[PDB]
Design a protein around this ligand. Structure first.
Ligand code: PC1
Ligand code: 3PE
Lengths: 80, 59
């Protein structure tokens, strides 16, 4: 069938450059592990205002002073 | 006698047909001349500057 794929590329080498890019953009988002970083960054941007919850007993974490040890690590990006 | 023009056949082998598919789709021709043979403007113009200068004749 490869003789076909070289005998449409002697006549219409145009749309073939579209298909060649048509796929290869569909396939790859399920591959490279850089993705799913993309979903973590985009969730953490505080559009809104954080509202402090009520602490009686627990209070699992997150003390009054924010810079004290509180919660997750978002600074894996700052070094990135 | 004779001659025959525009009588030729494409070669039809994958060493060639890239060379004709590196042409349609990458524009490797059509920039050959008018990317170039046009410029090629760097030659001195040819003008007889008229009210003063004038051109040749014969007796
Ligand atoms: C269906 C398979 C799709 C996935 C294939 C996986 C990709 C791997 C590489 C594929 C190699 C090429 C596979 C077959 C190529 C088709 C060859 C062919 O003659 O078909 C063109 C056939 C031949 O048609 P034709 O004989 O009338 O020639 C006219 C061709 N043009 C348009 C250049 C003048 O034409 C079509 O029907 C294509 C029309 C559909 C246009 C869809 C555009 C792409 C849109 C994004 C998707
Ligand atoms: C994995 C990543 C992806 C990998 C992809 C690999 C590369 C794919 C990308 C290629 C796509 C490039 C652009 C698309 C192709 C060019 C457009 C095209 O297909 O032209 C086809 C045209 C059809 O001609 P034809 O089929 O031969 O029919 C006539 C027969 N008498 O045949 C022609 O030649 C038409 C030529 C153009 C027509 C107008 C030209 C007029 C002059 C303008 C040229 C100036 C443009 C230069 C660009 C300037 C940029 C600053």
């Amino acid at each position: 069938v490869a003789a076909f794929l070289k005998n449409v590329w002697a006549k219409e080498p145009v749309l073939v450059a579209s298909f060649a890019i048509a796929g290869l953009a569909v396939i790859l988002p399920t591959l490279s592990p850089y993705t799913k970083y993309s979903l973590m960054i985009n969730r953490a941007t505080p559009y809104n205002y954080p509202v402090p919850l009520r602490d009686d007993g627990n209070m699992p974490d997150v003390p009054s002073h924010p810079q004290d040890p509180q919660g997750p690590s978002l600074e894996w990006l700052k070094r990135l | 006698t004779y001659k025959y023009v525009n009588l030729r056949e494409p070669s039809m082998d994958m060493k060639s047909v890239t060379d004709r598919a590196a042409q349609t789709l990458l524009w490797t021709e059509l920039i050959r001349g008018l990317g170039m043979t046009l410029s090629y403007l760097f030659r001195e113009p040819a003008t007889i500057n008229y009210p003063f200068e004038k051109g040749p004749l014969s007796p």
